[PDB]
């Protein structure tokens, strides 16, 4: 309950802090969603990658 | 986040392309020249002093 009001009193008394907070949060969330979608990507299709072919160095 | 995406995509669209970066290293041949003189030669895109 009081987490909202405490966080407000900490981070939303000025504006420059607000803008910095928005920029940093955007950075972190962007990277997190990148990581998540990548993980789903390799989960869905195993054995199809580039380095999962057995003979990729045996044409000499 | 979306504004950053669009700005970066548009600004990096103007950088050197894969075709140009493919031709960026090699070795070629010169000819003989007299002592103290010079005949300029050619390479990928740059002459040779």
């Amino acid at each position: 309950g009081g987490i909202f009001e405490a966080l407000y009193k900490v981070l939303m008394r000025r504006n420059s802090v607000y803008v910095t907070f928005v920029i940093a949060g955007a950075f972190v969330g962007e990277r997190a969603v990148d990581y998540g979608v990548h993980k789903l990507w390799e989960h869905n299709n195993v054995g199809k990658r580039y380095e999962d072919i057995s003979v990729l160095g045996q044409r000499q | 986040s979306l504004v950053r995406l669009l700005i970066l995509k548009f600004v990096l669209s103007m950088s050197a392309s894969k075709d140009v970066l493919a031709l960026a290293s090699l070795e070629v041949d010169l000819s003989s020249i007299e002592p103290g003189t010079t005949v300029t030669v050619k390479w990928r895109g740059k002459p040779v002093f």
Partner: peptide
Amino acid sequence: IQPTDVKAAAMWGVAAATGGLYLIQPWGW
């Protein structure tokens, strides 16, 4: 009157620097 203004200017500079390091992400610097 000066202290509040100069502190706000410094914090706005911090915000501008953070925005710059968001748009560009150089680990070589």
